[PDB]
Amino acid sequence: MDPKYQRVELNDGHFMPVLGFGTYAPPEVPRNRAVEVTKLAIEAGFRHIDSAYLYNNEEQVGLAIRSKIADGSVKREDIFYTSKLWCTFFQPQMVQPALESSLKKLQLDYVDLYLLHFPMALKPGETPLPKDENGKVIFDTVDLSATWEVMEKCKDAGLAKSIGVSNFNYRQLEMILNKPGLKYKPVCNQVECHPYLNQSKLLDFCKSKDIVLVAHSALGTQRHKLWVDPNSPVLLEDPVLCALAKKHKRTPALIALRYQLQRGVVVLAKSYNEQRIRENIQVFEFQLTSEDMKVLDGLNRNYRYVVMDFLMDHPDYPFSDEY
Numbered sequence: 001m002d003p004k005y006q007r008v009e010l011n012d013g014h015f016m017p018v019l020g021f022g023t024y025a026p027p028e029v030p031r032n033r034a035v036e037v038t039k040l041a042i043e044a045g046f047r048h049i050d051s052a053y054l055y056n057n058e059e060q061v062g063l064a065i066r067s068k069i070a071d072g073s074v075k076r077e078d079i080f081y082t083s084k085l086w087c088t089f090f091q092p093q094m095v096q097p098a099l100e101s102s103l104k105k106l107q108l109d110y111v112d113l114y115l116l117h118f119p120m121a122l123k124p125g126e127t128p129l130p131k132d133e134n135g136k137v138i139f140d141t142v143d144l145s146a147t148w149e150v151m152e153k154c155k156d157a158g159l160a161k162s163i164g165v166s167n168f169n170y171r172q173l174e175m176i177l178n179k180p181g182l183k184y185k186p187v188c189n190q191v192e193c194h195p196y197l198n199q200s201k202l203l204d205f206c207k208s209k210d211i212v213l214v215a216h217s218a219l220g221t222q223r224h225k226l227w228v229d230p231n232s233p234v235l236l237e238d239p240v241l242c243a244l245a246k247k248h249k250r251t252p253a254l255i256a257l258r259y260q261l262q263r264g265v266v267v268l269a270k271s272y273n274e275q276r277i278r279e280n281i282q283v284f285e286f287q288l289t290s291e292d293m294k295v296l297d298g299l300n301r302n303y304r305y306v307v308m309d310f311l312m313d314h315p316d317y318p319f320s321d322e323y
């Protein structure tokens, strides 16, 4: 009943909180930090928690969740936990073991959401980005419809409450939506989304197909060189974002998060700082005017931060299509 607990109904009948906590930290950050900041996020009132095999943190995020069930009280049903199937486990016979492996590290019985992390299959193995003798990433060929059938099987087995996708384009989503014998459609498409890349067209598509758009990188990314060019423009330093922040006596980050809430986008926010974690949940304590939203819509410039350019030659690279 406190606005911060607001949820949206998914196309499978389950409910997803509209604000999520992003948990990815680059490898240099101490592993035990994820435990502390996830506990802090739950204390702040975050209930939707986003992770993945790739983030190498599920043991730590699971510990924080279970500790807060044991006590800083939440109940399991109050938490909405997302994991993601990484590209090297897209072959049908390794989809379910990949989920069960994540659940073993988490020490939870189910995930609330399990996503295909990208539409791109990579060579099976222990290295997430497997490379050849020239340092080019090695690709794999998989029918994504067969991968999706095993995701459906995981939902039927009770191991994932809901299933979805991440970083899919409209034609790729359509390949799943128009699959013969489809049992469960994606609940969501988690994509990069912020005022410089507002995803109008993909958002319209998703809404027309009863798929939730979930915004990652909603504050312009953490700007880490593994994934993001440091010469790229700094979203939160934008003088128009800052002028609206000041008008509202908030911060640029809060403006960027509120933008998404008011357009019907579910939004993630990563912070490993206690004060900013507590600040971010204040997105529910103010409103942008319709005039503010039209100005924010005018910041759109089709600028993508997470380009994954070392995967540009993959047949199923998602970002070369218009949307």
Ligand SMILES: NC(=O)c1ccc[n+]([C@@H]2O[C@H](COP(=O)([O-])OP(=O)(O)OC[C@H]3O[C@@H](n4cnc5c(N)ncnc54)[C@H](OP(=O)(O)O)[C@@H]3O)[C@@H](O)[C@H]2O)c1
Pocket: 021, 022, 023, 024, 025, 050, 051, 117, 166, 167, 190, 215, 216, 217, 218, 219, 220, 221, 222, 223, 236, 251, 253, 254, 268, 269, 270, 271, 272, 273, 276, 277, 279, 280, 306
């Ligand atoms: N599916 C995918 O392919 C994919 C890709 C990228 C990300 N994600 C998910 O999306 C989550 C969010 O992405 P992200 O971590 O790249 O970036 P983000 O949420 O766009 O932004 C995080 C950056 O904003 C800073 N920040 C947070 N709150 C702030 C505030 N109130 N004021 C000023 N700065 C603030 C953070 O620093 P501090 O930590 O110091 O507070 C961090 O450097 C990830 O954790 C992950 O869960 C998914």
